[PDB]
């Protein structure tokens, strides 16, 4: 259960805070888990996805083992566009079919200084939590 009386835990209110969330909260909602090699290397469970991360599609009709780069992260519909995850229209043009990032695993990150300090902060928090649980 929840014991904090400030946490919402309401049906319509949580749906409101989900579907009317601003962009910096949508970035945290649209986070995806990492592969087992990346989890062993960084001790990081999940990360928000970026413009040019490498992605395997886990569930859906477009399920496969192909590592596809993200085309772009569209945070209004809570979706991402990947390179080879596309589909031909009636007029022959290909449109990228969006996949929700919960059905998305990261195989390679695009590392900059902000992502390095985020992963170091999360690894430090995991180390403090493991020391408190030990």
């Amino acid at each position: 259960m929840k014991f904090n009386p400030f946490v919402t835990s309401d049906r319509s209110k949580n749906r409101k805070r989900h579907f009317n969330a601003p962009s910096h909260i949508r970035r945290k909602i649209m986070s995806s888990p990492l592969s087992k090699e990346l989890r062993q290397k960084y001790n990081v469970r999940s990360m928000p996805i970026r413009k040019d991360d490498e992605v395997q599609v886990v569930r859906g009709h477009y399920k496969g083992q192909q590592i596809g780069k993200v085309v772009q992260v569209y945070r209004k519909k809570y979706v991402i566009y990947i390179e080879r995850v596309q589909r031909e229209k009636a007029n022959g043009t290909t449109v990228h079919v969006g996949i929700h990032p919960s059905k998305v695993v990261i195989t390679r990150l695009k590392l900059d200084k902000d992502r390095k300090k985020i992963l170091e902060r999360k690894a430090k928090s995991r180390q403090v939590g493991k020391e408190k649980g030990k």
């Binding site: 835990s9 309401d10 049906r11 319509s12």
Partner: protein, 259 residues
Amino acid sequence: VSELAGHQTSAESWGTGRAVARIPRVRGGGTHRSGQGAFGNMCRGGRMFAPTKTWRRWHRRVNTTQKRYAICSALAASALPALVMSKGHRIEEVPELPLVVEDKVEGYKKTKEAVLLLKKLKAWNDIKKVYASQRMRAGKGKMRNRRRIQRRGPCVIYNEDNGIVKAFRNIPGITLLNVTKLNILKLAPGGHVGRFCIWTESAFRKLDDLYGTWRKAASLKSNYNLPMHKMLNTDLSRILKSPEIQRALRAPRKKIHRR
């Protein structure tokens, strides 16, 4: 329902002399709601018959002796495994139904150790039944923060808080009750009196310091003795097959004399 609901309109009724029938209708306007109808339970919009009030007698207070009597009956039917199986608790490997465990049960701080204790006490089939009975609620309660339902499991009675409340906390079905703070709504949920209960040693010894025997006072309460039976020997089969009654009974008349 709010007092302003239905009477925010200013609808004076068209009287006699027109084809309308004596309904308070909206005065003037070039609107869809213009001479339409309000101020009645039969009208679209408007207010209903008997607006529900906040000053309804919502709450009920019971006599203290009746509450103590019902909670003593609930504690008495927490025994008697024919009343526990008819409640619906899987019991088939429970070694003794007044299940009294050590005082080291409050010393646990891990749900893994609590699950292991329930498995060694062989009461884990009730929690397994709760996992099997986790399904969706029927009706309009899903949009009213009442989405999921499950059964009630082994009610655990603890004396002191040393981690037992933190331990039997995410295991679905277990309700924790303090010894001096026993709840009728958790000892007999839904009005049905039987309930599978797991006691501790310092709870099973403190029940005698709560309610006593018939020849001793409550000793923690001010003025409360145990109630008396209306009849003591309820085995009326044994009573009627005893020779002291059948010596005085006569011969029956069971020859079916039909027409």
